Amino acid sequence: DVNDNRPVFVRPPNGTILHIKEEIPLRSNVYEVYATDNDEGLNGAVRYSFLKTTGNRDWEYFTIDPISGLIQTAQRLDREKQAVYSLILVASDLGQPVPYETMQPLQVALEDIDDNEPLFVRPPKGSPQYQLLTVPEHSPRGTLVGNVTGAVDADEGPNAIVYYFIAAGDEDKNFHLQPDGRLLVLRDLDRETEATFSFIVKASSNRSWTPPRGPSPALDLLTDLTLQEVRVVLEDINDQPPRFTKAEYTAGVATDAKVGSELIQVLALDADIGNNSLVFYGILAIHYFRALANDSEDVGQVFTMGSVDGILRTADLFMAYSPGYFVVDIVARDLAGHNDTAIIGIYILRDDQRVKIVINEIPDRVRGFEEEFIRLLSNITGAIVNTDDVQFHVDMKGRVNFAQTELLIHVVNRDTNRILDVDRVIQMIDENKEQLRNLFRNYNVLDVQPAIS
Ligand SMILES: [Ca+2]
Ligand SMILES: [Ca+2]
Ligand SMILES: [Ca+2]
Ligand SMILES: [Ca+2]
Ligand SMILES: [Ca+2]
Ligand SMILES: [Ca+2]
């Protein structure tokens, strides 16, 4: 005879796609091909063989015996590496004068197995290695903080259900994490009390997963990628009131009292942050007490307080009311109702209470540093030094030096919240002489004494 027919392919059937499991042993059987060459004799016996596809190297994954046609694995088959492997089979007759060949396409597709487990994916180094959620403080029960996420099981389908659970770190049980990944608030939280919480969440496919018995291996966020740190930070609300530094403030005013003079600066604190911390001040009423009297004479608005400055300022000349003092009731309020009260005592200082500080610089320059000098001095003296005026120096003899400057001041004892006799202030200066001796010279000071008899 002569090779007259080409082989034909009984199995595998035309354009078929075999499905096997993944990660099966090497050289594990897959399929047994069969083809028929009608020709009798060797011209019609078939010999099976894959084809070294040009770009497709998939054939490297299997072996097929030349006679038996049995297809066996040759490499590992991880669906996770490649899913469909595609091959072109070839059946040749042994016939002569030339053998004939027949090519049948085939494809192998792997079925997924629970090969892997749900795993997290860390963020870039340095960058925060955790996940942040935010929720308003004093939030109510149930308020969704937010949705944990960040895991994935390489697997497909049911082999990759990913449920989240809290592994450790809510010992106080402020939240609950429904497996879906929703974090719910359970308790009152107060930024001012605790600000950030944190804990470790587990990702497992086990809807019944329960934390290990507590003394077990402590966890390692650096190795276990089934774990992620989650940090909840509390947003702020206006839940804190303004709180005055003191509840009696005392400062002195001079009869000679340039209108608009800054007497003292109060302050109030709102623990709150941002707008909620904005504090606005003001004056509730003013009482005038003439020398010794138990009638609070109630003269006009004689003072002003900056709504934001907190600096009480003169509004009249007090040369009129020489004997006596004032009680100013003040208020501080936040953007939203929280309020606090206090009391300022302004006392018209007697000469007996007022001191001068001579300085060998032009008065202009003395104003240049007045604040600094006083701040330093008050610190070192540990007492409130309040600058009252800056004028040119006058010798007791009545000489006036147009390069020497005076600095009338009055002092209060933080401790007694009470004003000071010149006497006691001189003594204080002398006591601290040594500590102070540095300041005075650094600032061209020349002497100290009261309002000229
Ligand atoms: Ca043939
Ligand atoms: Ca796998
Ligand atoms: Ca798998
Ligand atoms: Ca899995
Ligand atoms: Ca707050
Ligand atoms: Ca507030």
Are 89 and 166 members of one domain?
no
Are 327 and 421 members of one domain?
no
Enclosing H/E stretch for 92? strand 84-93
Residue 1 lies in a domain: no
- Between CA 255 and CA 325 the distance in angstroms is 11
Residue 448 contacts by C-beta under 8 Å, 6 or more apart in sequence? 355, 356, 357, 358, 426, 429
Could you give the strand order of the β-sheet that contains 29-32, starting from the edge strand earlier in sequence?
A: 29-32, 70-73, 62-64
Angle formed by the axes of helices 433-442 and 363-381, nearest 10°:
160
Are 44 and 26 members of one domain?
yes
Q: Which domain holds residue 67?
A: 8-111
Are 104 and 179 members of one domain?
no
CA of 158 to the centre of ligand 3 (A): 10
Q: Which ligand is nearest to the CA of 116?
A: 4
Residue 319 contacts by C-beta under 8 Å, 6 or more apart in sequence? 255, 256, 257
CA of 237 to the centre of ligand 6 (A): 8
**Alpha-carbon dihedral sign for residues 207, 212, 217, 219:** positive
Are 51 and 106 members of one domain?
yes
Q: Which ligand is nearest to the CA of 24?
A: 2
Contact indicator for 361, 343 with CB cutoff of 8 Å? no
* Final residue belonging to a domain, choices 180, 210, 235: 235
Are 126 and 225 members of one domain?
yes
Beta strand 101-111 with 16-21 is: parallel
Are 133 and 227 members of one domain?
yes
What total number of domains does the chain contain? 4
Are 388 and 307 members of one domain?
no
CA of 275 to the centre of ligand 6 (A): 8
**Alpha helices for 86-190 (secondary structure H):** none
Residue 3 lies in a domain: no
- Between CA 109 and CA 107 the distance in angstroms is 7
Closest CA to 101 of 119, 88, 85: 88
Kindly report the CATH number assigned to the domain that includes residue 431: 3.30.70.3310
Length of the chain in terms of residues written: 453
* Final residue belonging to a domain, choices 77, 111, 145: 111
Which amino acid is located at 17 in the chain? I
CA of 105 to the centre of ligand 2 (A): 25
Q: Which ligand is nearest to the CA of 95?
A: 1
CA of 64 to the centre of ligand 1 (A): 20
Contact indicator for 322, 255 with CB cutoff of 8 Å? yes
CA of 22 to the centre of ligand 3 (A): 7
Structure-determination approach = X-ray
Kindly report the CATH number assigned to the domain that includes residue 217: 2.60.40.60
The long-range contacts involving 220-227, CB below 8 angstroms and separated by at least 24 positions, are 221/129, 225/119, 225/120, 225/121, 225/122, 226/117, 226/118, 226/119, 226/120, 226/151, 226/202, 227/120, 227/167, 227/200, 227/201, 227/202, 227/203
- Between CA 45 and CA 333 the distance in angstroms is 103
CA of 1 to the centre of ligand 1 (A): 10
CA of 144 to the centre of ligand 5 (A): 19
Residue 166 lies in a domain: yes
Closest CA to 234 of 200, 285, 195: 195
CA of 279 to the centre of ligand 5 (A): 14
* Final residue belonging to a domain, choices 348, 368, 394: 348
- Between CA 77 and CA 435 the distance in angstroms is 85
Are 228 and 124 members of one domain?
yes
The residue numbers preceding gaps of C to N over 2.5 A in the chain are none
Are 224 and 252 members of one domain?
no
- Between CA 115 and CA 205 the distance in angstroms is 12
